[PDB]
A and B are shown apart, each in its own frame.
Chain A
Amino acid sequence: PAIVGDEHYRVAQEVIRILQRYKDLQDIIAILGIDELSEEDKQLVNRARRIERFLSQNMMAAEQFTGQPGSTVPLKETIEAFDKLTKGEFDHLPEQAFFLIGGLDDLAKKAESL
């Protein structure tokens, strides 16, 4: 927080906490199935899936293959998007809406497209 903003550090630490729980629960998922988890865990898993898929991006270098332009999300928009995403404000969208999507408005438009 001394160098990055305090909100930035809080959001990043929350994302790391979620994606670490999800990794701990991945053993349970891969062995005993998702149904073995509790309602809270399953929420956390469903949120972490979307968090880790939202960390993906339509990278500029992909413009040669997919044709669609690359995305440059400002840092502030990323912080706000992940603050919303960790709180569960977008957990109702399908997981496919987050793959290779460049930002937050782009995410809406891949949501309304889905």
Chain B
Amino acid sequence: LADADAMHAKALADAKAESEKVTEEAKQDSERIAAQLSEQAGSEAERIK
């Protein structure tokens, strides 16, 4: 019972850690996608003028 409680606490800590690893991946992604879409916007604006 104590081992299972400790494993549950470790699982909650590991869930907090993947929430971190979801923020680290998702913020970096969102930033990169924003970068490529801004580059696409600039390229098409340059092409059009």
Asked if the two chains touch in their complex, CB atoms less than 8 Å apart, one says no
